[PDB]
Amino acid sequence: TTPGPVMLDVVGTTLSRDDARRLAHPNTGGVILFARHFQNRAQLTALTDSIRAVREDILIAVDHEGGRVQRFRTDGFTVLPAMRRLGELWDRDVLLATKVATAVGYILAAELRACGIDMSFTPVLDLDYGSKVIGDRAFHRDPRVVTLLAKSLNHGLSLAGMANCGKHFPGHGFALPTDDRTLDAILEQDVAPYDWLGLSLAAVIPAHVIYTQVDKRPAGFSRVWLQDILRGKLGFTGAIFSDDLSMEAAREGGTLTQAADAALAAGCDMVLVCNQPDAAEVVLNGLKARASAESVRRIKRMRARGKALKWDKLIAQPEYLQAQALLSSAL
């Protein structure tokens, strides 16, 4: 009853017999939700409940960053702003920006927790260099601003008992994309938020980027980035999730199973295989690596903390209503 290294997804709004088989697999350790898994809050809450009934130790995550990346947007879910908005608020009022960032984090996490979800793959720590796929998903250009805005956000997530996951290490702001900058330049700017956050950073997603001047391998498959730099230089002790291995160029010509074993060997504690459960099931049965005691420890600390308010109580909570007003007033 310990988490496995694979995070996959399920078939739809309710669990099928095939989902139950996959969830019960020892190498399964997480479920990532998408828009297709949300009809309404009642259905979503029932799904997460049924997932934990099959596998009590499972980690349930979702991409809730705000702006362009928010899977659940209806039936009462607060539409959250793009993180770039907070960087814009910082430039006009630093202290207010931190205050709002916390309110955004609390709403974000409180609403997910009311529906039985453990965590969100947020914040994005990539610097806003001016990448269309990142775009307004980044907080700011200045790594010191990204750090303190992200720190304030993760604080709000923590108020609801929710962890966090910075991405995409060591920096996606600047076949698989390449980055021909030197280690020093990458460290001095893009990595700085990861280092400065300290214990405020609970997990990392490495980017599917070749940092040519640093290592032949992508960050997610790089022992240099993950072991030497992230765990070694930065002393990071949190969980490392691979970025979606379903990307064509991520496999580098190999199978999903080989890419999964490579990421886990490089330093990943858990691999993501999204939008193809049958392919993820092949990985479950073909994976050579098994969850270690130290990886299990890190995965377990990503679970949500404490009791969550049900939706009917949350929307009338003073703190919740205070966050809403602050968000409405500042943006």
Ligand SMILES: CCC(CC)C(=O)N[C@H]1/C(=N/OC(=O)Nc2ccccc2)O[C@H](CO)[C@@H](O)[C@@H]1O
């Ligand atoms: C720097 C942007 C980067 C871009 C990589 C990105 O946005 N990465 C996201 C991602 N993207 O996953 C695919 O792009 N998969 C795909 C896309 C097209 C076809 C098949 C699979 O994965 C995980 C799991 O959701 C997210 O938390 C990541 O933030």
